[PDB]
Every structure is written in structure tokens, then in C-alpha cells.
From a paper:
Here, we present the identification and structural basis for the activation of xenobiotic C-glycosides by heterocomplex C-deglycosylation enzymes from intestinal and soil bacteria. They are found to be metal-dependent enzymes exhibiting broad substrate specificity toward C-glycosides. DgpA catalyzes the oxidation of the glucoside moiety of puerarin to generate 3”-oxo-puerarin, in which the 3”-oxo-sugar moiety is cleaved by an unusual C-deglycosylation enzyme complex, which is an α4β4 heterooctamer of DgpB-C, to produce daidzein. For clarity, the DgpB-C and [name]-B complexes are referred to as PuCGD and EuCGD, respectively.
Expectedly, our studies, such as co-expression, purification, and SEC-MALS analysis of [name] and [name], revealed that [name]-B formed an α4β4 heterooctamer in solution, as in the case of DgpB-C. To obtain more structural details of C-deglycosylation enzymes, and to examine the flexibility of the lid-domain and the loop regions in PuCGD and EuCGD, we also determined the structures of PuCGD and EuCGD at 2.85 and 2.54 Å resolution, respectively, using single-particle cryo-EM. These results suggested that open-to-closed conformational changes of the lid domain occurred upon substrate binding.
Numbering used by the authors:
A (entry chain G), D (entry chain E), E (entry chain A), G (entry chain C): 8 to 195, 202 to 289
B (entry chain H), C (entry chain F), F (entry chain B), H (entry chain D): 1 to 15, 20 to 111, 139 to 148
The structure:
């Protein structure tokens, strides 16, 4: 069934200040959360060209703490320059570099963040050519590239359906979706309309990873703003066996004296109550 | 690491579950040899655990209080927190625990932390 | 490093004294390429220093704004603060200085610091 | 004349948390303070057996920031054990290890802290045998071992005179005194009686380093509790050419948001006003 | 049954010149030889005080190449000084340091080489006190200390019987024997008399590791000077399940152009033919 | 490493056994980019294995000849031998094998080695 | 006057096998040869993206052995691909990367090897556009780019005159010549005609570094195939103050038991006899 | 390093020139403690230099024979050659020198090398 882990973005206010990479690995090991999600532009040293010594250290860390590298978070920075947009070839070269790096660190899923052109979060007009230029390498290396479905997007809206039509047209097994649980938030944007858990059912074949986003955990180890119970039961009743990765985005992350590890421990107590 | 003496990272049960562990950083401006450490008594949720149920892992090596008392060659650096492994059959229960550990050195700290089964 | 964006370490005059320098950490959860940086205007003790008088040293290499604008291969990591070298003949005077530097990135900070001659 | 520097003990609340060793070196470089005082049990990695790679990194740091290694702070831990006291041979072996390490890092002075047996800070009964067992090596390597004269001790009291009589008896050039400026504090212990600056004059031949201790710097860059002007003028008029090393011991070092670097910058603005 | 491995002493002419530690691990991985025997004074960096980084690198190497650390080769250097012999306490402290290091690197057996006083290879008169001072730590850490039985000693002679009487008297499970196969050599010292394989049968309860010493491997993958078939069948018929560690001592190790890896590959082809 | 171009370390079968692998060091005084490599034909015990059955692992990443032909950003250092993975179902038999591999670079080696099953 | 050094190409048969970078630095330090010439594609670790740690190690090595980084040897690989030639922009980007790296390691001269299209060693048709695209950066950073003048080219031939006309047209101070002394060889190619030393006189304004190539040193510390005395006297009489860098290219470099350090020591004994 | 016991790298005069130095690797399969070393007599061009004129630098620290005789805690690794500093006022002359150094260890090497002034 669904496994669990942590997205190191939850340690964004701690990483490099009070937490090293090994401290984050040991923190994950404390909760029994063995799926890890890293951001390529944050957690890889000398990125985008890490040394062999750093890669061996990464593998030692993964072995020491029983960490499973699940999701490699990267960006397709087509708007990286200000004077122009990157050609398709440049974006494909950057994406292939990130694919080779993700595979070299043991990751199986890649959370590719595409650049948007509208405020409906529509991807660049050539996102299909970039993805199709990168798909042979991702297939040879066994990597699944997955754009994130985040608020305010809807599991029924046009963005999800464009991605799903692309998947059906190419017949690809290395391109899917990463569902952020914010699309289920029901306790507080004009374009946002809460999805019901069942709305994730026709997408589960293409869902390869999920961001177990939470907003506030109570001292009774309950999430207060998202129907976590119904969502997780829907996923585990319909044959989802990817990971749920805890991702905390609360502003109080940057408050003086905040312990994000305790919030993730509460969230994973909840996820243990739900998954078993 | 953290400002607190008791570190939040590394607080977990030890597996059969034989006890638990937690990390303490040296609250001192210089490192000490293990013979200078005076381990005290642990209080988890008001329950007292005595000095003999706790071993100290420093530099990847585990020491009893008897072994530490005569060890003036092994150095505890201020930047490498010691792991303290407490023998407590069945380990700790899931949820919140109020740790209170006291120790000294020659020439008491509180912490509320979460356990996940 | 520090919590503030403008780091207190590395704030000094540049030697003949051609100006001064200060360090800024990236206030972002991911690293950026140099082409994403939008350097703004420095205000030292209310005196405005424009963008052209400031170069950015990243990964030990110095870049102008013109060079950074087209550099999407050099990566500014969040853990390695950039050095900003400001051309100001005679440098800063000894004592307190109120720095106010603003910059952005694509997809303003205050500091009171001391100069020693 | 007298040079200046910093004792990294002033960064005790920052070192290993927000300041690395290189950050401390760059902080010293900002103030133009080029004398450095380190504590062996704090700032040497894998102490007491640092690798060759770490020593080469130390030399690169010293060259990069124009740092002069002045004083190597170590302890004669004769009471390191609880069941007994170390024999003279064990203490001499520890001291020789520290001497070889101090010389290997370029230090010329060693601040040896002796263990005390009374509350008059009298050293152990065999401190002379330890020092005399270590003196041949310190002489071969060019190291000067210096116990610190701190409050409440008096520049006229029995401790300073025991050290001076030892120096005169052995005729040694590798054993002297490190004077802490707290013996001059006049603005607030029963046994303490403020020395006047002139009291340092008959000791200057044996003074090899001084701790420029300060208690509070004002925003006018003045020390408020120690006659720094008279003290420094006395030292520089009588041919002192060792270092004055800023040492901040204030409890507010551990306060949330305290910037000890700014306090050291004020202190060194003062020392620049005085030394020139 | 009996497993196999390599003693890195076979790479003594290559280690540090053309072979790193990782090259030796990969060489073992080529042959499928997963037991490793290291010498503490050779293969541990910054010995006897390796850094945590080096230990993590060692564990990464063991995981990457599926290496099992079997035997940690160390010496009880009681004659390390020339003016005197080490006291029992000094030898026990050195042995405890080696025990803690062996356990920290994952080794289960320690090949303790005792210093000899006669030419019958009789150990120092206080070897029992050294071993008994080290036995509590070896037992707590799960380490088995084993002196090597080498030529010209006899599996029936007085040395083996002194060790066996010690084992029976103390009733210890952390002290045994390491049998070098040279005691079976039958194809070429006055005191040497070839043992027959059956002579190893009354010792197998106390044998924790064996040095699969060979002298010359033929291109038909046969050892020509030792009855390897009878020896290995005797061990595997009587419930030996320790390791056989290939150890090549031939002088041609230091010949220009010698490939000791090919000789070990021949020896392990033989050991695979025998063990299966 | 070794003097020979074909290294003796790393010569083994690849596991179901899909082929084997061997290491080649760059016989050149400078490193080359992968686009400069011209992989040739392998001859194991006189049996010819063509260029398409061999991939090159460099810097821990595997490349086909098609991928290498357009790769002028990945650098093959002279001190880090390339791994060559040959597709040969069932792998090599135990015992001696005479490898003869030829390749060039823009601006043939022999070896007798042992396989252990 | 002219200084001396070594081009690490002379250690091409030793580097990475029996000599590390630090051994090469210490070898240079033995001869008093303080100018160093490195090849970017050989001696920089993780090239073309070395870590900050490696750069600090390089600076520690330069300080420890009093090495002066003189010449950074790089290649303009326009024919790096087989299907096409690199555009001018790609070559300029590679050259700018090499310029920034050369400046970051302290080098002042860059030996840019241009790709040739004829057998007269004529550079690519767009070498001027590449050099002119790189010249602003080389000028800002204080780097002098210099193509090597090697056999069979002539100091009077068309190649040298094209480079000199380019220098005069652009009026640049960051583009010059690196003269290899093989153009003076007189003791043994059809197109080769030995230059006389005076032929270097009209080029000395543009000569920024020279390769002190030698072919055979005699046990009397004399070069037998090149008029070294006349050449060096011509250079030092006409105000040359760059470096002469010993470069050994003899095939016996790869002979078993060859000591290239002793040959360089003979060559530098000669250069000391000549320079003083 | 090299196959020979006396290394060619590091053979130079020591500066006023107080003598010279050379490197010797440990000709042994395991490292030894300094107390196990028995330094012998140096012969440079047939001229005998006795044991007292030679100090041993190991792990960056210099030891006399008296200091080494009682040092069973400092370890000489086989991969880190010892530096031997010979007191010889005026150092060695430029040109060829035939070194012959003998030493042993508890439980003689030749070399022709060049000096450059």
C-alpha cells in the first residue's frame, strides 16, 4: 500500500543553518519515514556537478538511515533568462542533466516544475517538446517525470486533462502526475474549488507520487484543514502504492524557536494511524 | 545542531525494543575527556531512570559509566553530540514525552519531544 | 551563516581603498542561476549607490550585472552567500553604517554594521 | 609595539552553531585583528589527533586571512580522572602532545591552564616537574608556555611570584606569563584588589601574551570598567611587543540575537585608537 | 558452510602504489570473495585514530561491494620499545583500542599477533593477563580474538595446546584460533612436520577463521603444495562455517609486472570448485 | 591504477547474467569530452563484439555511442577509468579470456584476464 | 630577467600513477623552479567544475611550495564534435569558462591550443571571432591568451604573422605568443627550417611565455640539440622577463624505470647556469 | 610514491644552508610505531654521516632518535614517507650524489640523485 516519507522542503528554514543533510536523514529515520524528496537546487552540493565523493556520501547516508530516494524535485527553467526564453534544446539538455543526476542518486520519480505563462498555471507552449526530448533518457534510466498538481488547479480542470491526454497520446510510462493534497483543502483564492477524494480515482493510474501537504496538526495528531482520512482511504482502496511525502509550508516555519521536526512527527503519527 | 542541550534529532526507540535513545550536546565552550563527564539521572515523564541504565555513544563507540570513569584519552567534542542509549524494555510509547536529563563535568536540561512507534 | 540576509562577516573596505564589500545570503528555499538574480540599489547611511557600482562574487568568480544577466549556467547555492563589492573611492568611514540593500529573483534588507579602518 | 588579535573564546556561543572556523578567521580579518588565540579542545578537528588534511586547511586559512597564530590555549588536566591524579609522566606526555600540535599549527605561545588545589588558585604541587619535563621540547620547537594570570590573583600576590621565581631559577626563555586585563578592573570577590597599570612593569620581561579582556564597550568605542588607556600606554612605553587578544566573557554572549562580532569590532576600534 | 574471502596482505606490494582501498574492495568483488581481512597498521587511515568521515567511507565501501569485514589483523606490540617491555596495562589499553576499532568497522574476528620470546613462537609470559584484561570488552562488543597458528607450529604442539587449555580454563567464547594452512604444506625448517587434515578436527570448535594460504596456483586452478581438497573437505564435513581467507606470501609479489589479483582469482576459482 | 589500458580490476560478469564489463583508462595526457571518444570493436577470445553491444559508464553515468557522440560537456578524466559494459547473454565463461579492445579519440590494446563465475 | 619553471606535461607518464599534484609541486620546489604550467584537462579535479575545497587546496599547495602559476594550458575544442563544428558562441563560452578558471587559480597566461584545418597548422577560420569574444573577459581578469608556436612553424612564417597582425590590429595586451623552443632545434619534417635565436627578437614584445623544450640533456648538464645558450642570451638581452618552462616530450618518458624528475633537474641546472 | 625506499622527490638542501633532506618510505607491509624504528648511518658520496646528525619528520612532526626511541604512540604509515633532515653545514653541492642509507625496524638502500643549488 501507500508508503510515507518527507519532502526536505519542510526543513527549508533549518537546512544549512541548524540542520545538515545527515540531520535531515536522521530526522526522517526517527519518524520511520523512509521516503525522501529532495530539491536539486538545494540539497546537492556543487550542483549541478556534484563530485563522486559527495555521491558516495549520499549513498552512505541513504544506507545508514534506510532512506529510500523517492522524488527528485527539479525545475524546467525556461524563463531562467530575462532577455529571451530557452530553446527547446537547452531545456532538454538541462532536463537530461537532472534526469541523469536523479538516477545517479537512486531516485525513481522526478517532480518537474514547469514554468507557467498564464495564471491558470498553464505550462509553456513547448512543454510537450521538452518532455518528449527527455522521455527516451528517462525511460532508459527508469525515471518517471511528474509535474505537480497544486492549488488552485483542479483534478477536473484543463491542466490535469492536458497532462492526461499527453500521457494517453504518447502511451508513456515515464510521465505522470504528482498530486499535492492542497487540492483537497476544505478549511481556510477565487479559482480554487475543493476536490472531493473520489476525484483522485480516475487519475490514480498516472499518479506516481503525492505531496502529503498539511497546514496545521493538532496535539491530538489530527490534520484540521484536509480530509486526510477519506483521501488516504481512497488512495489505498484503489491500489495506490506510491509515497505520501509530508510537506509543511506554514509561514511559522521561519518563526524563532519553531520545531518543524515535531510537526512532521505529529503528521507521521497521523499517517501511521491511517496507513498502518 | 540546536541551541538546546537535548537534541530533538535522534530521539527514538531502540530495536525487540530494548529501550530508547536521545542526543545531548556538550553545554561547554571546550571539549572534555570522557573521564570528566559525570552522568546523572534521567527523568522521562517524571519516571526516574538511573545512571546504570544509560550508556554513552561518543565517536561511534559505546561506553558505560564504569568505562567512561577511567577514559581520559577519548575526547568529546562540543560539535558532536553524544548519543545516550537508555535500557527500557518496551521502549517509549507514541506521543509526547517530557525528558529531564542532568549531567555535569569536572575541571539539568528539559525537553518535550515526540516518539513515533 | 546567519539569519539575516546581509551577513555581518565580510563587511570591510577593499584595498588604495577602492570601495567596500558585504555578504548577502540567498533568502530563498532553492538556489538560483545568476540570470535569475535582479540586483537592486544599495543605500549606505541613506546615500544611494546604484546597481552599476556593485559586482557579485559567486563561487569565487566576480560578475557584473551585464555578465549575470546572461548566465544561466552558474548556480548560486543558498548555503554560500554572495560577496558584493561596491566601488566607492575611499571606502567607508570607521564606525556604524546602516546598510539597506534590495534585490530580487525571478522564477529589501536592513543591517547596522561596524567598519574598522 | 603591541599588536592585536582575538581569542576565539569570544565566539564560544557562535562557534559550531552559526560560525565555522573560516567565519571566525574572516571576522578577525574584517577588524584587521591578525593575532588569533584558539582553544585546543574546541577549534581543532579530531583533537587531539588532527589529520594532515585538516592541518593543511588550517594553514590555508591562516594564509588567506593573514592570520598570525599567537596563542594556543590548552589545559594541564591533572585532575582529568576522578579516582586519582595523573602522574607527572602522564601530564608531561599530554603537554608534549599539545606542544607539538601548537608548533605544528604555527603557534608561538601556549596558554597552559594549570589545575588548582586551593581557592587562591595555587597550582598542583608538581606543576614545576610537569613544566620542566615539557621545557626541552618547548625550547627545541620555539614554544613559550604561559599560565594565565586572572582575577582574583594579584600581580603582586604569591602566585605571580612563584611563577617569576621559577623563571629566574630555571633561567628559561620558554616559560612566562599571560596577563588577563581583569586584574586591572576598577568598575563593578573578596580577594580581588585592582592593580594599577604600573604593577605590570616589573613583569613585562616575562609577559609573552595578554588577554585584552573587556566587560562592556560603549557606543563611543570606550571600555567602561578597565583603565585601558593607562594599561596600554604602560605596556607600549615599557617595550611590550606581544599581542593583546580581545576576550569577551559577558553572559549576554548567549543571549538571543547577540552579535559578539560587533562588540569585538568596538573593542578593536578602541585598541586601534590606543595602539595606532 | 565455509565462506571465502581475501586477506589484503596479498596486496602488500600493490597497496598504496597502484591499488587504493576501493580497488582492493572491487578486486574482491570481482572474484565474489566477500570476506575481507585487513591489517590495522596498514589499511586504516590516520591509524590508530581514524576520523568519522573515514569510517563512513569504509562503511560505504563495504556496502557498495558487498564486503563482509571478517578479520581485523592487529599486533600486541609488547616489544614495541627497546629499553623495556610494555606493562600489562599498556598492552591491554592498546588491545582495547584495537578491539573498539575492529568493532567500529564491523569486524567480528581479531587476528591478534602475539610477540614471541623463544623460537618455538612461545608468547610473552603475560599474554594470558593481556588477553584476560581485554576479554570483557571483546565480549561486550562481540569480538573474537584469535592468535594465528602458523608454520612451523604444529596443531599438536605445545603452543596450540596452551591456547586450547586457556580457552577451556576461562570457558571463553571470544578467544579462539586462526589456522594458517601452511601447517598442511607437503611440497617444498627443521621443526616443521606437515599436519594431516584430520589434525584440524579436535580444534574446529575453537577455530573462528582460517588463512587459506597458498604457495603456487597452476593454470589448471590447482594448488600444488597443500592438500587443499582434503583440508577443505575436512573443515566442511565437521561443521566449520567461518571464512577461508586467501593469503599470498610469495616473493614474486614484488616482481615487476606481477598481477597478484590473477593469482587470487585462480585461488578462488579453486575454492569455488571445492566449496560450491 | 595500472599501466595497461585495459584494467584487470572490474573485469566480471554482469547480473540473470546479461553480459560482462571491463575498465579502460584513457591512454592520453589530457582528459577528453565524450564526443571525442571513438569506441571501436571488442574481441574476446577472437570472437568479435561490435560497437553497439558496449556502453560506456563515465562519472557514474552510462552512455551509448549515440549519446556520447553529441556529449561535449561530460569530461573523461585520465585518472578515472571508464567502465565498458558489454551485452553478451550468459556472460563469459570461467577461466582465461584474451581481450582485445580498440578505441580512439579525436583532437588497440590486449589483455589476458581471468573470469570467476 | 627570465624566470624558470616546469610544465607538468613533463610528468605525463607519472601523474596519477606514481606522482600526485603535491608530488609535482614538491618536485618543482626541489629544483627551485617556481613557474608552473598545468593542463586544464589533466590537473584540475572534477574539471571543468572544481569544488571550492579543491581550489583552496590548490592555493595551499601554491603557498606551501612557493609555486607561481604561470601558464594555464587549455584547448579551443571547436572540432570536439564529429557531426559539426561548434558555433562561435559555444567556443567563446568554453573559452570564458577556461579564462575564469585560470584566473581563479592565479594563472596569468593561458596557452590556448587552437584547432587546425590544414597541415600548415592554420587555425580555424573563426579563431579571431572566438578570441575577440573572449578578450573582454581576459582583459577584465588580467589573463593573457597565447597560442603556442611549435614545430614545424617558423617565426617568420604565415602563422606567426597572422597572430602578430591580429595583435597589432586589435591593439590588445591580452593576446600574445607562447614560443616553443623546438623552433630552434638544429640536431636531429620537410616544412621545418631551424630559426636562429635572433629571429625571436621582433616577436619579444608579444611573447608572454616560452616552453623551454629540450630533447636530450647530457650528464654535463648541457642540451645537445638546441642552441640554448644563444637563445636564452638573446631573450635576456632584449628584455624578456616571462618564464621559461621546461617541457620534456621524449618517448622514453614512458620507459620502465625512467626518472623524468632527474632529467628536469639536469635541464634546470642548465637554466641556472644560463640565467643566474 | 615510488618503488625505491629512498624517494627522489624531496631531495634538496635545507636553508643559511644547514644541511639537506631526503624522503624514505617504509619498506614493510605494515606501519610501525616510532619506537620500532632503528635509524642507521647515512653515506653520501662515501662520506659517512652518523645517526645523531639526522632527524625524522613523520606526520609533520620532527623527532630525534632519543625522542623516537620512547615513542610508541606515533605511527609511521607505509603510505606516508618519512622526511630525514641531515645536519650538514653548507648542504650538498650541485650535481649527482650517491646516497646509501640503512635503517631497520623491530617486531640498506642506494640511490643516485641530483641536487640543484
Amino acid at each position: 500500500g501507500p508508503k510515507r516519507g518527507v519532502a526536505l522542503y519542510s526543513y527549508s528554514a533549518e537546512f544549512g543553518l541548524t540542520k545538515t543533510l545527515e540531520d535531515c536523514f536522521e530526522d526522517l529515520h526517527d519518524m520511520g519515514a523512509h521516503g525522501i524528496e529532495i530539491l536539486a537546487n538545494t540539497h546537492i552540493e556543487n550542483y549541478p556537478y556534484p563530485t563522486d565523493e559527495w555521491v558516495e556520501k549520499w549513498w552512505r547516508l541513504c544506507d545508514k538511515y534506510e532512506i529510500v530516494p523517492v522524488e527528485y524535485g527539479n525545475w524546467i527553467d525556461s524563463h531562467v533568462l530575462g532577455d529571451r526564453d530557452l530553446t527547446t534544446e537547452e531545456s532538454v539538455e538541462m532536463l537530461k542533466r537532472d534526469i541523469r543526476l536523479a538516477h545517479r542518486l537512486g531516485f525513481t520519480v522526478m517532480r518537474t516544475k514547469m514554468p507557467v505563462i498564464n495564471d491558470l498555471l498553464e505550462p509553456v507552449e513547448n512543454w510537450k517538446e521538452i518532455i518528449k526530448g527527455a522521455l527516451p533518457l528517462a525511460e532508459e534510466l527508469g525515471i518517471k517525470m511528474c509535474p505537480e498538481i497544486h492549488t488552485p488547479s483542479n483534478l477536473k480542470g484543463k491542466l490535469v486533462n492536458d497532462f492526461v491526454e499527453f500521457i494517453k497520446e504518447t502511451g508513456t510510462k515515464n510521465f505522470g502526475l504528482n498530486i499535492d493534497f492542497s487540492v483537497f483543502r476544505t478549511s481556510f483564492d477565487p479559482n480554487y474549488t475543493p476536490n472531493k477524494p473520489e476525484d483522485i480515482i480516475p487519475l490514480l493510474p498516472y499518479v506516481y507520487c503525492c505531496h502529503a501537504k498539511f497546514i496545521h496538526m493538532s496535539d491530538d495528531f489530527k490534520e484540521t484543514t484536509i480530509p486526510y482520512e477519506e483521501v488516504v482511504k481512497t488512495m489505498e482502496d484503489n491500489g495506490y502504492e506510491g509515497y505520501l511525502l509530508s510537506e509543511y509550508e506554514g509561514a511559522d516555519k521561519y518563526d524563532e524557536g519553531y520545531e518543524v521536526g515535531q510537526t512532521l512527527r505529529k503528521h507521521h503519527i497521523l499517517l501511521k494511524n491511517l496507513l498502518g | 545542531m540546536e541551541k538546546q542541550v537535548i537534541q530533538s534529532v535522534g530521539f527514538r526507540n531502540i530495536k525487540e525494543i530494548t529501550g530508547f535513545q536521545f542526543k545531548v550536546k556538550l553545554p561547554y565552550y571546550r571539549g572534555v575527556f570522557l573521564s570528566q563527564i559525570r552522568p546523572g539521572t534521567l527523568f522521562v515523564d517524571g519516571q526516574k531512570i538511573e545512571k546504570d541504565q544509560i550508556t554513552w555513544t561518543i565517536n561511534g563507540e559505546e561506553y558505560t559509566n564504569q568505562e567512561m570513569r577511567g577514559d581520559f584519552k577519548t575526547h568529546w567534542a562540543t560539535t558532536k553530540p553524544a548519543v545516550l542509549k537508555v535500557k527500557m524494555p518496551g521502549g517509549l510509547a507514541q506521543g509526547y514525552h517530557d525528558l529531564k536529563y542532568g549531567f555535569c563535568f569536572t575541571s539539568v536540561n528539559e525537553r518535550r519531544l515526540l516518539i513515533v512507534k
